[PDB]
Amino acid sequence: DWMPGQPRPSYLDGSAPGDFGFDPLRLGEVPENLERFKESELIHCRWAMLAVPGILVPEALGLGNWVKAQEWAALPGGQATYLGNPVPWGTLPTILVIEFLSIAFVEHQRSMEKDPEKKKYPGGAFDPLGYSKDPKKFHEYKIKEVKNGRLALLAFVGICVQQSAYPGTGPLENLATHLADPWHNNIGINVLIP
């Protein structure tokens, strides 16, 4: 039980990785569905692990905001830039096509899997270092991944919510704003009134 004193649902015997017996809605009663879920949690997590840094690091520099980068796309011509340099491939139609074409192919590739999407742990070219060589060791890593992935997903959120309300977004920035006067600057002020 990871809700301190709450009986664990039947299906979760705590053997899965990241299994803390949490499923108040029992969306996992169905085995076929749960398996799909385990796969998805990882996917969603993998991105998130990537996204926070993606969003956070540039701001430490000249990102200003994840939001800000999206800003050029709206006006014609862009052209947008990565590090003060326009292009290559600057305009939106080119990026959109490149993204749609490049992406669709990679994912659909996923949608050609059996053996539980290679157990959502493909480990082909992907595990070059072959961390998964050792089963005992491999298991520990999965837990790390999920816990880390979860941590990341949760954080992304806060970014969006924080980003909401404070359209003067400053995920890294807000923190400062918190730091300055943490007592009079908190979400609390945001949960209430002027």
Partner: protein, 91 residues
């Protein structure tokens, strides 16, 4: 922009159809099967599939497939051609 855009989109679409999404699309068609009213639909109905027109020498693709992907191709392409000249402007 020229007429060349039509070709790339249609070309890519066709490409997508023939080598990327081709295996999956068929898998689905097999499962879906043809329509049946109480079972099959050719049983009365005068009208039934055309096996011959369906058949093709290429290792995988058929003429009908060409039609659909090309159409998506043309549509997607014409879609880009029009959004260009509208010069629509938003906030």
């Amino acid at each position: 922009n020229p007429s060349l855009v039509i070709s790339l989109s249609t070309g890519l679409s066709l490409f997508l159809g023939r080598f990327v999404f081709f295996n999956f699309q068929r898998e689905n068609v097999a499962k879906q099967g043809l329509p049946e009213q109480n079972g099959v639909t050719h049983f009365e109905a005068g009208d039934s599939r055309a096996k011959e027109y369906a058949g093709v020498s290429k290792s995988a693709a058929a003429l009908v497939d060409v039609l659909a992907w090309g159409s998506i191709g043309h549509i997607v392409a014409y879609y880009i051609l029009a959004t260009s000249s509208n010069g629509y402007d938003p906030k």
